[PDB]
Amino acid sequence: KERGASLQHTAPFGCQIATNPVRAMNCAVGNMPISIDIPDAAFTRVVDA
Amino acid sequence: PSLTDMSCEVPACTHSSDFGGVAIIKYAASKKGKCAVHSMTNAVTIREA
């Protein structure tokens, strides 16, 4: 009866917190470097465009 | 056949030893018929004849 506020109500950056297993979902901090390696079948020749 | 009003553009090119370039040529022809294509520059080789 004195816990206060769980982390899903206090944590910054709009964090969302769950348990079993404990997780911090959808933090808004930083940037995600996404590297994509795509095959040549996907492309289309410039003349074909 | 005689050809007039010829314009040439290179949508994309690459010196990759395997015909890495393409050229598009617009033309106006007097009549239908086969025509010889020849590159007057040793530095550039054209696949089509």
DSSP letters, B1-49, are --EEEEEEEEEEE---SS--EEEEEEEEESS--------S-TT---S--
Torsion, Cα A40 A47 B11 B5, to 10 degrees, reads 170
Question: SS3 for A17?
Answer: strand
Compute chain A's Rg from CA coordinates. Answer: 21
Q: Which residues contact B19 (CB under 8 A, 6 or more apart)?
A: B47
Question: How far does CA A40 lie from the centroid of its chain?
Answer: 28
> Residues of chain B whose C-beta is under 8 A from some C-beta in A?
11-12, 22, 24
**What 8-state DSSP symbol labels residue A36?**
-
- Residues in chain B with CB shorter than 8 Å from the CB of A47 are 11, 22, 24
Question: SS3 for A24?
Answer: strand
Count of pairs with CB atoms under 8 A, one residue in A, one in B: 7
| CA–CA gap between residue A49 and residue B7 (Å, rounded) | 19
Kindly provide the resolution of this structure in angstroms, with one decimal. Answer: 3.1
Cβ pair A46:B24 closer than 8 A:
no
Counting other chains too, the contacts that B12-19 makes at CB distance below 8 Å and 24 or more residues apart are: B12/A46, B19/B47
| CA–CA gap between residue B7 and residue B28 (Å, rounded) | 10
